[PDB]
Design an enzyme around this catalytic site. Sequence first.
Site, short mmCIF file in Angstrom:
data_model
loop_
_atom_site.label_atom_id
_atom_site.label_comp_id
_atom_site.label_asym_id
_atom_site.label_seq_id
_atom_site.Cartn_x
_atom_site.Cartn_y
_atom_site.Cartn_z
N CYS A 1 0.79 -1.22 0.00
CA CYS A 1 0.00 0.00 0.00
C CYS A 1 0.83 1.27 0.00
O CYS A 1 1.78 1.43 0.77
CB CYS A 1 -0.98 0.06 1.17
SG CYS A 1 -2.10 1.48 0.93
N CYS B 1 0.12 5.24 6.79
CA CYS B 1 -0.50 5.32 8.11
C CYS B 1 0.36 4.68 9.20
O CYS B 1 0.65 3.49 9.18
CB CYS B 1 -1.88 4.68 8.08
SG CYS B 1 -2.93 5.39 6.77
N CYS C 1 -1.30 1.26 10.44
CA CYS C 1 -1.61 0.14 9.57
C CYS C 1 -0.45 -0.79 9.28
O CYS C 1 0.69 -0.37 9.16
CB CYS C 1 -2.14 0.68 8.25
SG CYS C 1 -2.52 -0.53 6.94
N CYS D 1 -18.03 -7.15 4.00
CA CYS D 1 -17.19 -5.97 3.78
C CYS D 1 -15.87 -6.21 3.07
O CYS D 1 -14.89 -6.60 3.71
CB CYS D 1 -16.90 -5.30 5.12
SG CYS D 1 -18.38 -4.79 6.05
N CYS E 1 -20.72 -3.98 1.29
CA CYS E 1 -20.03 -2.75 1.65
C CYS E 1 -18.55 -2.95 1.45
O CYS E 1 -17.97 -3.87 2.03
CB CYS E 1 -20.24 -2.41 3.11
SG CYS E 1 -18.72 -1.72 3.86
N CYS F 1 -20.09 4.63 6.19
CA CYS F 1 -19.55 4.05 7.42
C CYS F 1 -18.24 4.78 7.66
O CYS F 1 -17.27 4.55 6.95
CB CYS F 1 -19.28 2.54 7.26
SG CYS F 1 -18.41 1.79 8.69
N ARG G 1 -20.09 0.69 16.01
CA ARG G 1 -19.49 -0.63 15.90
C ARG G 1 -18.19 -0.86 16.64
O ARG G 1 -17.13 -0.40 16.22
CB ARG G 1 -19.22 -0.98 14.45
CG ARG G 1 -18.41 -2.24 14.28
CD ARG G 1 -18.14 -2.44 12.83
NE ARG G 1 -19.35 -2.26 12.04
CZ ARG G 1 -19.40 -2.24 10.71
NH1 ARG G 1 -18.30 -2.40 9.98
NH2 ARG G 1 -20.57 -2.06 10.12
C1 LIG Z 1 -8.48 -1.77 6.89
S1 LIG Z 1 -8.43 -0.01 6.44
C2 LIG Z 1 -8.62 0.18 4.66
C3 LIG Z 1 -8.50 1.67 4.43
C4 LIG Z 1 -8.48 1.99 2.94
N1 LIG Z 1 -7.32 1.33 2.31
C5 LIG Z 1 -8.33 3.51 2.81
O1 LIG Z 1 -7.40 4.05 3.44
O2 LIG Z 1 -9.18 4.09 2.10
C6 LIG Z 1 -9.76 0.88 7.31
C7 LIG Z 1 -9.37 1.22 8.74
O3 LIG Z 1 -8.84 0.09 9.43
C8 LIG Z 1 -8.22 0.66 10.62
N2 LIG Z 1 -6.99 -0.11 10.90
C9 LIG Z 1 -6.26 -0.77 9.99
N3 LIG Z 1 -5.23 -1.35 10.60
C10 LIG Z 1 -5.30 -1.05 11.89
C11 LIG Z 1 -4.51 -1.35 12.98
N4 LIG Z 1 -3.44 -2.11 12.83
N5 LIG Z 1 -4.86 -0.88 14.20
C12 LIG Z 1 -5.95 -0.13 14.36
N6 LIG Z 1 -6.73 0.17 13.31
C13 LIG Z 1 -6.42 -0.27 12.08
C14 LIG Z 1 -7.91 2.13 10.26
O4 LIG Z 1 -8.82 3.00 10.94
C15 LIG Z 1 -8.21 2.16 8.79
O5 LIG Z 1 -8.52 3.48 8.29
S1 SF4 Z 2 -4.91 2.27 6.09
FE1 SF4 Z 2 -3.35 3.71 5.26
S2 SF4 Z 2 -1.89 2.14 4.58
FE2 SF4 Z 2 -3.51 0.69 5.24
S3 SF4 Z 2 -4.78 0.24 3.39
FE3 SF4 Z 2 -5.96 2.09 4.06
S4 SF4 Z 2 -4.52 3.69 3.29
FE4 SF4 Z 2 -3.28 1.84 2.81
S1 FES Z 3 -16.88 -1.73 7.36
FE1 FES Z 3 -18.47 -2.52 6.00
S2 FES Z 3 -19.89 -1.28 7.17
FE2 FES Z 3 -18.31 -0.53 8.55
#
Ligand SMILES: C[S@@+](CC[C@H](N)C(=O)[O-])C[C@H]1O[C@@H](n2cnc3c(N)ncnc32)[C@H](O)[C@@H]1O
Ligand code: SF4
Ligand code: FES
Lengths: 312, 313
Positions: free
Chosen positions: A50, A54, A57, A94, A125, A185, A257
């Site tokens: 990616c 972040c 992440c 999801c 979703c 969401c 949630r």
């Molecule tokens: C799985 S991600 C996919 C986000 C998508 N790629 C974007 O940035 O548009 C959605 C949310 O998962 C949460 N998340 C992912 N990894 C995490 C972690 N290791 N600890 C806490 N939250 C996490 C973050 O809030 C993240 O924005």
């Molecule tokens: S959380 Fe930040 S790094 Fe992880 S998938 Fe969404 S955008 Fe990519």
């Molecule tokens: S992630 Fe699919 S509804 Fe919140």
Amino acid sequence: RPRWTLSQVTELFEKPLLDLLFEAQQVHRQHFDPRQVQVSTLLSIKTGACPEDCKYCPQSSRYKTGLEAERLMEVEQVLESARKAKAAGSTRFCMGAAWKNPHERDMPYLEQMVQGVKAMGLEACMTLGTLSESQAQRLANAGLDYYNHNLDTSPEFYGNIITTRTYQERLDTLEKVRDAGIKVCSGGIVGLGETVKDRAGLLLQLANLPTPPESVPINMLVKVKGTPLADNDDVDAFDFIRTIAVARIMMPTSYVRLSAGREQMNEQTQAMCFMAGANSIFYGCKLLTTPNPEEDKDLQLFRKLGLNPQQT
Amino acid sequence: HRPRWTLSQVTELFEKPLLDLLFEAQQVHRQHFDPRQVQVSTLLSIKTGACPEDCKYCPQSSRYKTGLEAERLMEVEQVLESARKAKAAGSTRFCMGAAWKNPHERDMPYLEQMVQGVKAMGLEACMTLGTLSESQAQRLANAGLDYYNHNLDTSPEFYGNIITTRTYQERLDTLEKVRDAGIKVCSGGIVGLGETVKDRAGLLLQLANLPTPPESVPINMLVKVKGTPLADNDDVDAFDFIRTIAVARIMMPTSYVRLSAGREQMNEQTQAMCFMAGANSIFYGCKLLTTPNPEEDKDLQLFRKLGLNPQQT
Ligand SMILES: C[S@@+](CC[C@H](N)C(=O)[O-])C[C@H]1O[C@@H](n2cnc3c(N)ncnc32)[C@H](O)[C@@H]1O
Ligand code: SF4
Ligand code: FES
Ligand SMILES: C[S@@+](CC[C@H](N)C(=O)[O-])C[C@H]1O[C@@H](n2cnc3c(N)ncnc32)[C@H](O)[C@@H]1O
Ligand SMILES: C[C@@H]1NC(=O)N[C@@H]1CCCCCC(=O)O
Ligand SMILES: C[C@@H]1NC(=O)N[C@@H]1CCCCCC(=O)O
Ligand code: SF4
Ligand code: FES
């Protein structure tokens, strides 16, 4: 319609926890059927490499975290897992890509996925990042019932965590989805380094919107060796609690949630949470890449507390 | 005389959807008590060790191993001593506890003398000496004693599997002796002895349908101790030790439900759940009678996290 001032929300984060919890429930019961919780199971349509950075992440190509980078799975592979999850008992599916924004070449497949998931009988979703007016209307036309897009924290802190995107850049995406005719969401994470004020700012943010998100996830930080946040101070449960409380009060009509990090939480806490107002969870072995409480343990706790008519 | 809870009326609760029960709980509690306000009593063992009775759960029972350094009744000073450190320590009520079946006439002068000092020292005085008798009561009362402890532990229909050296009734008798004596009654039980949902029900249902239910109603969670026949026992799901408090709160509004014995084993959230449930009294200190107890600080600290009391410095 009336909104929320900040010195009006900080009030809550300061309120005597227990008492806050009470109001919480008080509210929740007036807008939802308690003892009833929302169950969504997700998978990573595409995980790994990616672009973004972040600090939390584990998929960010910017860090170690040794993650077996996989490539977008065929429509079958998805619908496959989608099925096992429907039968598994979940209501909403999801899909989540590890992109900044989807690609036009993707769409046909992303579209095709929503098709199967929508016809399969469950909610669809996906979270693909920053989609654009075109993509949205396309996903909507295909079916997609919800779109995920988080604000993670206060705009005044987004910088310390995420940089490859404009805090605003996201807000824009929500509205694109809003107008698209899809459910929003949006939520955040707790314990990134943020402060009581920051968190406040977050809710206060997605709370004072045209029409606050139907679902409002509240993840607890999942420290992962590699991510710059890995070595971080754990958040007192009571604070991850309070956060849900506020959210419940601040957006009555919304589904809060309890997600990401439940695996780290103990029975009581989740209980506290549900009481707090939390009424949706991710159900399954794993969510996107970290561990999640196993279906049974979940089902079992669900009954101890007496939630749902999902007993066999 | 007033209304009495039926059993098929209490079992209803133990069956009610936990969360919802918790709600009613709070609902009730707030109507009779000042939430965010908790009762703090610290106790010591006026006399510990060699005990006649055979409670399957107690570690003082002379009937079992549990290698307990048997000590002999401490002088009035020794008591008032610890009593003081505890007053200053911030506790409101002092609880002396002997390991007897019943006090002895030779004791009284000292037991009396103790209540004296504790009562004048400025704090509440409450001791548990077992089965006292009309005479002893009136004597303790005259001295000061504000409370008397005497538990029912469980359903009468189960008392047998735990305690044998006493008649379930034998205790009820003692309460009334204390009642009429003009002293506050602190009566409660233990959870997870082997009892069942029904048994527990029976317990509350018991001390609940009394002339005038106990002011304080402790609810201890079983403290497994190597030696006691209960030692090797199944732990009780927190949620069940929770529910138990909930019911008690609803069943005796006017009463103080004291989350006690076993807090040390409980985690932050749980105690929280408990306080919410209705629990509004605790034992504050390093140790209670003979087992471990959460340290003053940890207690004080949690007290604030949840926002309980004006005891912040
Ligand atoms: C799985 S991600 C996919 C986000 C998508 N790629 C974007 O940035 O548009 C959605 C949310 O998962 C949460 N998340 C992912 N990894 C995490 C972690 N290791 N600890 C806490 N939250 C996490 C973050 O809030 C993240 O924005
Ligand atoms: S959380 Fe930040 S790094 Fe992880 S998938 Fe969404 S955008 Fe990519
Ligand atoms: S992630 Fe699919 S509804 Fe919140
Ligand atoms: C400290 S004792 C003294 C009782 C007194 N000797 C009498 O019989 O009147 C009071 C109560 O503490 C509780 N208790 C004592 N040890 C316990 C343990 N190990 N685990 C749980 N509860 C215990 C029991 O309910 C007991 O009756
Ligand atoms: C997409 C879902 N929405 C959300 O807020 N969290 C989920 C994402 C996973 C969070 C836990 C860390 C991981 O992905 O491994
Ligand atoms: C006398 C008090 N009343 C009660 O119900 N518990 C306290 C006694 C201690 C209970 C925990 C086990 C122990 O005594 O160490
Ligand atoms: S509980 Fe009270 S009575 Fe039963 S053995 Fe221990 S001290 Fe003796
Ligand atoms: S033990 Fe002294 S009051 Fe309950």
